[PDB]
Design an enzyme around this catalytic site. Structure first.
Site, mmCIF file in Angstrom:
data_model
loop_
_atom_site.group_PDB
_atom_site.id
_atom_site.type_symbol
_atom_site.label_atom_id
_atom_site.label_comp_id
_atom_site.label_asym_id
_atom_site.label_seq_id
_atom_site.Cartn_x
_atom_site.Cartn_y
_atom_site.Cartn_z
ATOM 1 N N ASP A 132 -0.613 1.989 2.855
ATOM 2 C CA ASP A 132 0.605 2.309 2.106
ATOM 3 C C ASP A 132 1.494 3.317 2.838
ATOM 4 O O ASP A 132 1.243 4.525 2.795
ATOM 5 C CB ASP A 132 0.225 2.877 0.735
ATOM 6 C CG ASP A 132 1.439 3.205 -0.114
ATOM 7 O OD1 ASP A 132 2.535 2.681 0.186
ATOM 8 O OD2 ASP A 132 1.294 3.984 -1.083
ATOM 9 N N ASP B 44 8.213 0.701 3.148
ATOM 10 C CA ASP B 44 7.097 0.909 2.230
ATOM 11 C C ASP B 44 6.181 -0.310 2.147
ATOM 12 O O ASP B 44 6.451 -1.256 1.402
ATOM 13 C CB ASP B 44 7.654 1.252 0.845
ATOM 14 C CG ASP B 44 6.571 1.590 -0.164
ATOM 15 O OD1 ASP B 44 5.375 1.557 0.196
ATOM 16 O OD2 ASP B 44 6.926 1.891 -1.324
HETATM 17 C C1 LIG Z 1 0.457 -3.611 -2.833
HETATM 18 C C2 LIG Z 1 1.616 -4.049 -3.714
HETATM 19 C C3 LIG Z 1 1.360 -3.735 -5.190
HETATM 20 O O1 LIG Z 1 2.496 -4.145 -5.956
HETATM 21 C C4 LIG Z 1 3.563 -3.232 -6.178
HETATM 22 C C5 LIG Z 1 3.351 -1.839 -5.927
HETATM 23 C C6 LIG Z 1 4.387 -0.884 -6.134
HETATM 24 C C7 LIG Z 1 4.073 0.524 -5.863
HETATM 25 O O2 LIG Z 1 4.407 1.431 -6.632
HETATM 26 N N1 LIG Z 1 3.346 0.786 -4.736
HETATM 27 C C8 LIG Z 1 2.905 2.156 -4.395
HETATM 28 C C9 LIG Z 1 1.403 2.098 -3.999
HETATM 29 C C10 LIG Z 1 0.569 1.158 -4.861
HETATM 30 C C11 LIG Z 1 -0.258 0.191 -4.238
HETATM 31 C C12 LIG Z 1 -1.046 -0.700 -5.015
HETATM 32 C C13 LIG Z 1 -1.011 -0.632 -6.431
HETATM 33 C C14 LIG Z 1 -0.191 0.331 -7.067
HETATM 34 C C15 LIG Z 1 0.591 1.220 -6.286
HETATM 35 C C16 LIG Z 1 3.777 2.764 -3.277
HETATM 36 O O3 LIG Z 1 3.263 4.031 -2.907
HETATM 37 C C17 LIG Z 1 5.226 2.962 -3.732
HETATM 38 N N2 LIG Z 1 5.921 3.871 -2.832
HETATM 39 C C18 LIG Z 1 7.013 4.757 -3.271
HETATM 40 C C19 LIG Z 1 8.181 3.932 -3.860
HETATM 41 C C20 LIG Z 1 6.440 5.727 -4.326
HETATM 42 O O4 LIG Z 1 6.546 5.503 -5.532
HETATM 43 N N3 LIG Z 1 5.825 6.792 -3.785
HETATM 44 C C21 LIG Z 1 5.196 7.832 -4.599
HETATM 45 C C22 LIG Z 1 6.173 9.019 -4.791
HETATM 46 C C23 LIG Z 1 5.515 10.131 -5.645
HETATM 47 C C24 LIG Z 1 4.164 10.602 -5.036
HETATM 48 C C25 LIG Z 1 3.203 9.415 -4.768
HETATM 49 C C26 LIG Z 1 3.883 8.309 -3.925
HETATM 50 C C27 LIG Z 1 5.643 -1.322 -6.603
HETATM 51 C C28 LIG Z 1 5.872 -2.705 -6.863
HETATM 52 N N4 LIG Z 1 7.087 -3.140 -7.331
HETATM 53 C C29 LIG Z 1 7.655 -2.567 -8.554
HETATM 54 C C30 LIG Z 1 8.975 -3.287 -8.768
HETATM 55 C C31 LIG Z 1 9.111 -4.316 -7.648
HETATM 56 C C32 LIG Z 1 7.867 -4.116 -6.788
HETATM 57 O O5 LIG Z 1 7.647 -4.771 -5.774
HETATM 58 C C33 LIG Z 1 4.827 -3.637 -6.647
#
Ligand SMILES: CCCOc1cc(C(=O)N[C@@H](Cc2ccccc2)[C@H](O)CN[C@@H](C)C(=O)NC2CCCCC2)cc(N2C=CCC2=O)c1
Length: 370
Positions: A32, A213
């Site tokens: 990630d 990301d």
């Molecule tokens: C592997 C893909 C999974 O599907 C997904 C996963 C996510 C998602 O939120 N991924 C997470 C990890 C995860 C991986 C697996 C499961 C859950 C989360 C990733 O870290 C997101 N990065 C940024 C945008 C973020 O929010 N960072 C945080 C900031 C605060 C401190 C912590 C870090 C959005 C998603 N979305 C949402 C709308 C459209 C889309 O594609 C579909």
């Protein structure tokens, strides 16, 4: 030996095998670039095949501090500690790293994903509880001779730690600056659909921020940009009409197996800031990238897809569906991200995803939002 060390898909995540603890406990860990915490399931969960068992590790150290991490999708809480970590199909080193042992979670773990934890590869500035919690890759570089760089080829796929693998891409590598070291933040200077400029003040493309990301599935766009992009994509594909729910990324669109009308959907070009003043390059995204296949035996008389471009209130997210088909170099040492066409590409016989340049721009506006 690092080639093909990833498994997974854009919808559920790409993961690499790691070990934690002494003796080594094997776990599959999602890669990630959109977060900075290393965390693993550490208690039973309905969707976990296995988890980190701290009591079995002689090298585990409890940090006596809890941690909570909210993502766009899912959240978890856990206990901080450190332990020994290795990557069997990566560099042959072992490092002591911070690990969040996940003890409770909501909508984080995914049924059938085959991973049990997450490797946040971004910078300490976005680590929780705060930037004092050194991220894994920082520990790896400090404790070994591994160069401060990694690359991702999402297809399975490859994470090349400490270097670039030429066998994984074709043509030239183009670099865009990392604007700030927290997320892997970049600057988009122009967006075209079917070659047609969206004609928007370029700060709009980066409103709040734009990030690369691997942990997010979709290309996520700021509301204003999203609405404009959907309008243009609708116009290009207008020979067929789809329900609003499709464009909202909710419901599937299906065609008889093998008959998907790729040609009626446009190519999307994202122009990224170059390393020289007013120079840019573009990466081009085919519909095979932004219409995400949804495997379901029940619907398998058809090929069905979700529209994998969606709205954001927190800036652009260049997620996995964008990264697939490209080889992406996270060059931390030089504060830049490189893009090249991947050896694993999905192009039909008419159009090919590309990374190309240079382009010049007359408008002197800085496209960063700030
Ligand atoms: C592997 C893909 C999974 O599907 C997904 C996963 C996510 C998602 O939120 N991924 C997470 C990890 C995860 C991986 C697996 C499961 C859950 C989360 C990733 O870290 C997101 N990065 C940024 C945008 C973020 O929010 N960072 C945080 C900031 C605060 C401190 C912590 C870090 C959005 C998603 N979305 C949402 C709308 C459209 C889309 O594609 C579909």
């Amino acid at each position: 030996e690092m080639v093909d060390n990833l498994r997974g898909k854009s919808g559920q995540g790409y993961y690499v095998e790691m070990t934690v603890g002494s003796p080594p406990q094997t776990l599959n860990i999602l890669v990630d670039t959109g977060s900075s915490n290393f965390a693993v399931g550490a208690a039973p969960h309905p969707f976990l095949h296995r988890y980190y068992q701290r009591q079995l590790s002689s090298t585990y150290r409890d940090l006596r501090k809890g941690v909570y991490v909210p993502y766009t999708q899912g959240k978890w809480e856990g206990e901080l500690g450190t332990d020994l970590v290795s990557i069997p199909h990566g560099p042959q080193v072992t490092v002591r790293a911070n690990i969040a042992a996940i003890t409770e979670s909501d909508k984080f773990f995914i049924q059938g994903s085959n991973w049990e934890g997450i490797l946040g590869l971004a910078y300490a500035e976005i680590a929780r509880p705060d930037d004092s919690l050194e991220p894994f890759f920082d520990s790896l570089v400090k404790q070994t001779h591994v160069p401060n760089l990694f690359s991702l080829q999402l297809c399975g796929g490859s994470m090349i730690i400490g270097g670039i693998d030429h066998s994984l891409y074709t043509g030239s590598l183009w670099y865009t600056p990392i604007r700030r070291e927290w997320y892997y933040e970049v600057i988009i200077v122009r967006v075209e659909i079917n070659g047609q400029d969206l004609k928007m003040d370029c700060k709009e493309y980066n409103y709040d921020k734009s990030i690369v990301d691997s942990g997010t599935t979709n290309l996520r766009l700021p509301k204003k940009v999203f609405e404009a992009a959907v309008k243009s994509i609708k116009a290009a594909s207008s020979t067929e009409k789809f329900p609003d729910g499709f464009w909202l990324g909710e419901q599937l669109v299906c065609w008889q197996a093998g008959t998907t009308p790729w040609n009626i959907f446009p190519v999307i070009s994202l122009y990224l800031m170059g390393e020289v003043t007013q120079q840019s390059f573009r990466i081009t995204i085919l519909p095979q990238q932004y219409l995400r296949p949804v495997e379901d035996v029940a619907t398998s008389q058809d090929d069905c897809y979700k529209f994998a471009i969606s709205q954001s209130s927190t800036g652009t997210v260049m997620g996995a569906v964008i990264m697939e088909g490209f080889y992406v170099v996270f060059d931390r040492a030089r504060k830049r991200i490189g893009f090249a066409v991947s050896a694993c590409h999905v192009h039909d016989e008419f159009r090919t995803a590309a990374v190309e340049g240079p382009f010049v721009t007359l408008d002197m506006e800085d496209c960063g939002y700030n």
